[PDB]
Amino acid sequence: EAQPLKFIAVDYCPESCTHSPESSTITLTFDHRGGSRWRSTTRFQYGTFSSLIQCPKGNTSGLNFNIYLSSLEGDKSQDAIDFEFLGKDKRIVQTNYYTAGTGNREAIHDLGFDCSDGFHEYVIKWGPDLIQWLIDGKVIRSVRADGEGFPQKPMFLYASVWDASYIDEGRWTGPYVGCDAPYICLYKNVNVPGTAV
Numbered sequence: 001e002a003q004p005l006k007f008i009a010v011d012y013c014p015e016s017c018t019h020s021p022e023s024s025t026i027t028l029t030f031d032h033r034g035g036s037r038w039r040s041t042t043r044f045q046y047g048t049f050s051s052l053i054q055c056p057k058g059n060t061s062g063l064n065f066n067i068y069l070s071s072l073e074g075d076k077s078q079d080a081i082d083f084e085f086l087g088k089d090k091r092i093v094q095t096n097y098y099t100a101g102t103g104n105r106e107a108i109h110d111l112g113f114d115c116s117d118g119f120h121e122y123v124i125k126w127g128p129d130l131i132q133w134l135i136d137g138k139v140i141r142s143v144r145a146d147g148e149g150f151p152q153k154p155m156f157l158y159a160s161v162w163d164a165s166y167i168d169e170g171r172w173t174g175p176y177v178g179c180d181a182p183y184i185c186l187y188k189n190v191n192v193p194g195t196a197v
């Protein structure tokens, strides 16, 4: 069971995030101001998380748009589970998860569409032994604890837009060209789990 996320917090640059109780839509803008990041106001202990997302039009090289769970953004030993769009290529999405700070579980999926063409539904189902990633109702990846480290700390829902062109000398998301700024990423109908802590 999930229900609409009624309140969010904005972690930095609140001028670059728009939201309103009358709107089911949240927007994140990247431009010279440097992007922003919103989150749920509580953590959650397992459950189903979802959003419709429409990514920005234009040449998004360099940028990272995302929606993810994390025990605390900026923590070096965080638990987390990610959808990340890599701006150089809007027909793919990257999934990954972190256990006590250790990641390196990247997988690249072909979307079958351009993520800026319209709204699509991105879902994370997170349980104590199982993580599923779904796009438009289809399971694209799933993983189990398998006797190894697994995300178990309570986690916030997060989403940001940022300039990741500095990562891996631009190999990860591309150089930031920035010719279609402002880049507006749309989130609509965000839902969250009864497991808030």
Ligand SMILES: OC[C@H]1O[C@H](O)[C@H](O)[C@@H](O)[C@@H]1O[C@@H]1O[C@H](CO[C@H]2OC[C@@H](O)[C@H](O)[C@H]2O)[C@@H](O[C@@H]2O[C@H](CO[C@H]3OC[C@@H](O)[C@H](O)[C@H]3O)[C@@H](O[C@@H]3O[C@H](CO[C@H]4OC[C@@H](O)[C@H](O)[C@H]4O)[C@@H](O[C@@H]4O[C@H](CO)[C@@H](O[C@@H]5O[C@H](CO[C@H]6OC[C@@H](O)[C@H](O)[C@H]6O)[C@@H](O[C@@H]6O[C@H](CO[C@H]7OC[C@@H](O)[C@H](O)[C@H]7O)[C@@H](O[C@@H]7O[C@H](CO[C@H]8OC[C@@H](O)[C@H](O)[C@H]8O)[C@@H](O)[C@H](O)[C@H]7O)[C@H](O)[C@H]6O)[C@H](O)[C@H]5O)[C@H](O)[C@H]4O)[C@H](O)[C@H]3O)[C@H](O)[C@H]2O)[C@H](O)[C@H]1O
Pocket (backbone or CB within 6 Å): 011, 012, 013, 032, 033, 034, 035, 036, 037, 064, 066, 068, 070, 073, 074, 080, 081, 082, 084, 098, 158, 159, 160, 161, 162, 163
């Ligand atoms: O992807 C997804 C996921 O995945 C997975 O899971 C993984 O694992 C994860 O991680 C992920 O996630 C993601 O990630 C990413 C990355 O990251 C990561 O990794 C790495 C690490 O590192 C990290 O941590 C992690 O996280 C991300 O992305 C990112 O993010 C980040 C953030 O984060 C962080 O944070 C948050 C938290 O939570 C934590 O911590 C963490 O996390 C980010 O960062 C950020 O950024 C931003 C932006 O920026 C950028 O962009 C843009 C550009 O520009 C830049 O360069 C860059 O950097 C930032 O922001 C910033 O800040 C600063 C600080 O604060 C600021 O500055 C300031 O300003 C102010 C002003 O302001 C204004 O204007 C403008 C606007 O803006 C604002 O708002 C307004 O308000 C100023 O104030 C002033 O002051 C003055 C004084 O002072 C001066 O003097 C002295 C000296 O010393 C100084 O220096 C100077 O300044 C004053 O003056 C005075 O006055 C008085 C009075 O007067 C008055 O009255 C009267 C009349 O007559 C007059 O005229 C007036 O004036 C007088 O008397 C006297 O004379 C004078 O002097 C004034 O008043 C005032 O006003 C200040 O000062 C300054 O300082 C700025 O502005 C801004 O810009 C921030 O900080 C940062 O942090 C990054 O970037 C990204 O990339 C993501 O998110 C995730 O999700």
